[PDB]
Structure formats: C-alpha cells, structure tokens
C-alpha cells in the first residue's frame, strides 16, 4: 500500500496473506468469506506471462495477522488448501477480465477477535454503494512505493471513479466486470495498492446495516500511485453467481 497508514489491531479480521511455502514469501492478499473459503484474485495463482502457476500443495493461507514478517504465535492461524478454483473465463491473455479465485481450506478456521469473515454483497448493497465518489478501503502488506515493505498491515481509503474517467486513463480495454478506484491528480490526496497487495479486499461499510462488504478484489494497475492512473478491481457482485455456484456445488 502506497501512501496509506498502519491498520489498527483487529481492523480487518477478514484479511488474509498468501504465503509461498518455498521460498517462504508473500505472494498476494486475500479475504476470508466463511470458515472454509478464502477469496482472492486469479492472477495470484495463475499468470502464464510471468511463469506463475501454483497448486494447492504450493502455498499456505495465513489468517489473523497484523505483522508482515513475524510468526504471530497464539493469534494467527496458518491453513492448508484443499482445492483452488479459478474462474473458467479468466482472461489472462488480454485484460485480466474475471480476475477471481476461490480457495477451500482443508479444515475450517475458528474465528476470534482477529479472525472474522467479511460479507459478500447482495444486488441492493451493490446498487446503492458502488457509486463514483464513494470511498472504499484497501488493505495489505504490499510495497509502500512503486520502486520498502511495511512492518504491519497498511490501510488506505480510496474513492470510486467514474467509468468514463477509468477508460480514458488506460489503453487496456476495460470490461463491466472491473471498476477502478483512486484519487485524481487535482484532488490533492494520493494512495494506491502495489505489488503484494493484489488479491486483497476492497471493502465498504454499509450505512444501512453497519456491516462491511467486499465490493472488489485488487486486480491490476499500471505502476503504483501514478498521477492520472488508477487501480482496477474485480467487480465482486457481478461474479457472485459463480461464487455461490462453486460453494454450493463443491
């Protein structure tokens, strides 16, 4: 996270860390949606261009963390994955359309003061909250600048941006399944995700029921916190059907 600030203890109980077995390293962020399902971006598990193609036996899911590097004894819980599911229509060759994946833990994790699931949105909550100018919040242990690592989970609040504005800032063809967020060069405030943050949750707190909903997944950006550029997120609600499907079926 670029231009963010230290998260408060227990601020994002749903935050997860995608940890590589060997070499032991931070791969991506993710989010806990139930006691046996973790939600992340697909490009975290598969991206041929960068010779990335991990399997269940390749990584660990660490939940309940605050510190990036420390093994937080008695607080965090490390899980093994039973099955990874990538969206059957993830366009990694072109624009990362449908950058989403589900991971099923081997054994349920127990909630605590530091481990708690985030809500998935329903049509209404998405209809009402996903509006340009409305701020969301992103979290992660990713790099603090495009080109170093924070000590503890970072957080930054960003506003959602007008679709036309997003389109005109990139050459990449954006789809309905994505939305971009960020500040404009004039607004005089900055902030953005960055390497190691991707796969993380972009949440919003419902002013109606006081709950937190994940409205997006950090998907892709062109650099980090660049003026006139914005971070793109996977439109979670737009792909909810596939989520339910995978969960119910499997």
């Amino acid at each position: 996270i670029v231009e963010g600030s230290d998260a408060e203890i227990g601020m994002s109980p749903w935050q997860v860390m995608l940890f590589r077995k060997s070499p032991q390293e931070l791969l991506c962020g993710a989010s806990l949606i139930s006691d046996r399902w973790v939600l992340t971006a697909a490009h975290c598990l598969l991206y041929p261009p960068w010779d990335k193609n991990f399997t269940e036996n390749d990584l660990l899911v660490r939940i309940g963390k605050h510190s990036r590097t420390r093994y937080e004894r008695n607080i965090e819980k490390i899980s093994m994955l039973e099955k990874i599911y990538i969206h059957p229509r993830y366009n990694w060759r072109e624009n990362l359309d449908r950058d989403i994946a589900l991971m099923k833990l081997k054994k349920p994790v127990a909630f605590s003061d530091y481990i708690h699931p985030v809500c998935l949105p329903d049509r209404e909550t998405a209809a009402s909250l996903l509006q340009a100018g409305y701020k969301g919040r992103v979290t992660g242990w990713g790099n603090l600048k495009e080109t170093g690592q924070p000590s503890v989970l970072q957080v930054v609040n960003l506003p959602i941006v007008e679709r036309p504005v997003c389109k005109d800032s990139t050459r990449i063809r954006i789809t309905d399944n994505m939305f971009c967020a960020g500040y404009k060069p004039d607004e005089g405030k900055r902030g953005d995700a960055c390497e190691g943050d991707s796969g993380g949750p972009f949440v919003m707190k419902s002013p109606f029921n006081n709950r937190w909903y994940q409205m997006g997944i950090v998907s892709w950006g062109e650099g980090c916190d660049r003026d006139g550029k914005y971070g793109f997120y996977t439109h979670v609600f737009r792909l909810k059907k596939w989520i339910q499907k995978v969960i119910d079926q499997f």
């Binding site: 408060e8 227990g10 601020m11 109980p13 708690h116 699931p117 100018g133 409305y134 701020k135 937190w212």
Partner: peptide, 28 residues
C-alpha cells in the same frame, strides 16, 4: 455468514476505527 462483516473489536463493542468516518461521510 450470520455475523459477517461485524468486527469483534469494533462493531460488536460499538467502537469506531480511526478512519471509518471518512468512508461514511462519502456516502451521500
């Protein structure tokens, strides 16, 4: 989940976090 999105150390205790007001004030 039944109590999804409700944070044990904040909502369940009715305490707010350092910056959540920012989000809320953006929701016109």
């Amino acid at each position: 989940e039944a109590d999804c999105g409700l944070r044990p150390l904040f909502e369940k205790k009715s305490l707010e976090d350092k910056t959540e007001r920012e989000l809320l004030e953006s929701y016109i």
